[PDB]
Amino acid sequence: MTTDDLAFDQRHILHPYTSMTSPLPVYPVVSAEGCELILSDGRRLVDGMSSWWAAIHGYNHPQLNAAMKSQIDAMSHVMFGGITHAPAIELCRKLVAMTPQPLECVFLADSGSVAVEVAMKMALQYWQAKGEARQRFLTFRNGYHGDTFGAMSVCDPDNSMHSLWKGYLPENLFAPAPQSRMDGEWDERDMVGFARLMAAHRHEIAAVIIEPIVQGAGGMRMYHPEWLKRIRKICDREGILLIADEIATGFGKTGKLFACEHAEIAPDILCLGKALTGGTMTLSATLTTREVAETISNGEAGCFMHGPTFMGNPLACAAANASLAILESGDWQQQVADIEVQLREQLAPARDAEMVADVRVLGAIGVVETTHPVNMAALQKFFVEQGVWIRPFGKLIYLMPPYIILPQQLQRLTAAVNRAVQDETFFC
Amino acid sequence: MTTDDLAFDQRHILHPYTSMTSPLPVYPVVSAEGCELILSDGRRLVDGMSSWWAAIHGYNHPQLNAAMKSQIDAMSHVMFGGITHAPAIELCRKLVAMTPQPLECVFLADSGSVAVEVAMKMALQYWQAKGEARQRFLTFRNGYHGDTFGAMSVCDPDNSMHSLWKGYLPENLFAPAPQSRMGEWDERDMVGFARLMAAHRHEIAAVIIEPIVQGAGGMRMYHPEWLKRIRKICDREGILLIADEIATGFGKTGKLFACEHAEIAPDILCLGKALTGGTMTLSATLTTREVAETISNGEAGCFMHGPTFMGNPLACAAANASLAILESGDWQQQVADIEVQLREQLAPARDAEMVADVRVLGAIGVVETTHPVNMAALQKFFVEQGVWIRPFGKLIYLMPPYIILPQQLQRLTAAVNRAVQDETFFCQ
Ligand code: NA
Ligand code: NA
């Protein structure tokens, strides 16, 4: 990669949520292996982000590589319309078996936002088929479910700047963000807001949608499992569908295979992505119950009205399959368990740093919330200089490393966070 | 694949737009090579669909294969937030170079519907930043733009069963489907469109259409004069023009991009399907400096979107290799020769009783029937003829790989003519 290459990227290439007139620096990666990213100039970085929570087995994993190459030898892609294939079947087999019992119907798709759109469409078509006028969604503040129109309609209105689309997006119901902590105690006062909304709109609510236990992009919040129990039961009593968006929490990240396990509940609709493929390429899945799948198919439309061009992509399914196989060994439990203890122990000190507001850890997720917003360009440069890859945002410096990280590598990550928050150099 | 594998697929795996209470047969594919699919029983099928218009160079292409495997050796994925890489740089250079001059800013995404979602979001953010109350989209009837909620809102209300979502979907403006055929131009065709423009010009955020070919909404082929007039009306009113080329892009209609047929440039361009040579999902939305800059200078400070697998290196490497094959220029004469053979060999369908119309454009051949096809019976018939053809509603259509051998194309056109001779394969 030359500097002419980099100039082209700056001038012509949009990146996620970032200015085109005032872009900040981006770092050129040429390769990756184990828990390391390798920059154009040869510098090696310990990855603390797992490429946004997806690369749970790291990079250039032998088993993922072998699976992907063997699938390329067979066929990289074939359409799913009237056709099925081994990688899709094996993948759906594992997904059904590894999730609660009632979730036995799988809709594969290409990205997490699309998986959410699917869930929402499933809920609307379900009620339409039942003859009930239910088109509203009840969600939590601080939630994040994707960037498409429907997914945006259930994202935190303030976080996502809904004023930009005021009049275009449908207006849903927003209960207050859950206050009780995953670490701490339950407080029944937490429920009043949600109960008042349910009492007033019970008759028009299509589904309740939330991220179980951990609210990711909306604040790295970690709330009490009692919430899911309460919600599940309310939805049960009222007949309302429950959608669990586990695109970020799925596949071992919070200490359990699926965060719903922390509450011992099952949603009617389950959304999966990110770590599904071991972070090799995009893929998503939405699982539901027989009751939902059949009810939809029996309505006016005769089917679930959705079907993306690359639905069931073999290459991505094979990668996903190999990822799940690594997990079946059960090794991830001990790895995550150990990462959780090392994160609690090594981020604890940051609680005393002046720029820190809170420190929370769950599974392989370690968060340092600061009092002021970070200086993006300066802090990013700092992490790179320390030989680590950490990508902060707003007031959140967080780590979510591959499960195969070595204690020495993890220690390099925690050391870097602790050093970043020791004064105001990199803030505002 | 065992029989138990197939049974599992039937009862637990959703497929595109098809019933889970009355599921129809699917055919198990083990691999693919050249222009053929290979079933579990050893049967080889000539692919007439290109996996829904994407696999323009066929299957197991050695160059596509080597490019994917090589990138896997370097890294199949790394996040795009704060990072860039060769495969994305190289792809954006080609996309910018091969499209019209004003289209020079690229937003890569994972699927086509998202590309459209991105285009619609660009138009809304653009007007918001300019302080103008513009939230309507003006489009054509019979249009198809994707399955996610925003895309759905510009799809044909009747074809897409909008009654199902009445009250959730924003209400856009729908001008009459273009009548003039790809045929003589009739000025009266414009009355509709003009009426809508006059009553809502102050409110229209953008005009969105599929240029020349309306695919999924009816495989319709209309006069290029329409694009000329729409470009002129949009210039005059100062409205943005979105051209959805997810289906027409990369050679399909005999020109690299269908907007060429009118020598017009849109403000926003959507690409997908054949972008990667049909190996895996990837999409792209290009726009102008005016749009990208205006948006980044508005209140949000950026364009508000960023999928997790944005810029996926493996997908980008695949697309680069696919674009490199097209660079040779061989596709032009390949598509021209396919157009001739389609015209010549579909002509006979005009003597068949079940046919309503026959139309061909570039590598696309369409036989529209008088009655809806019997999906299960017609699909099995084609498989028995050693071809893969996937019809729908009243359309039996062909979009084969550019490298298809004349004897392979003959097998496809022969099967179509046979299917439409009588009622056997019709209704259900
Ligand atoms: Na299950
Ligand atoms: Na261009």
What brief labels describe this structure?
homodimer; 428 residues; alpha/beta; Aspartate Aminotransferase, domain 1; Aspartate Aminotransferase, domain 2; 7-stranded mixed sheet; 4-stranded mixed sheet; globular; binds sodium ion; aminotransferase (chain A); protein homodimerization activity (chain A)
Explain this structure.
Two copies of one chain form a homodimer. Chain A folds into two domains: 1-60 and 331-428, Alpha-Beta Complex (Aspartate Aminotransferase, domain 1), CATH 3.90.1150; 61-330, Aspartate Aminotransferase, domain 2. Chain A starts with a helix and ends in an 8-residue tail after the last helix. In chain A, α3 packs antiparallel against α10 (314-328) and α4 crosses α10. By secondary structure, chain A is an alpha/beta fold. Chain A is globular. The first copy, chain A, has helices at residues 3-12, 50-53, 62-74, 86-98, 112-130, 149-152, 192-201, 226-238, 290-298, 314-328, 331-347, 376-385, 407-420; strands at 27-33, 36-39, 44-47, 83-84, 105-109, 136-140, 173-175, 205-210, 214-215, 221-222, 241-245, 269-272, 284-288, 356-362, 365-370, 388-389, 396-399. In chain A, strands 5-13-12-11-8-6-7 form a seven-stranded mixed beta sheet, with helices on both faces. β4 of chain A pairs parallel with β1 of chain B. Bound molecules: sodium ion (2 copies). Chain A: GO terms for molecular function: adenosylmethionine-8-amino-7-oxononanoate transaminase activity; protein homodimerization activity; pyridoxal phosphate binding.
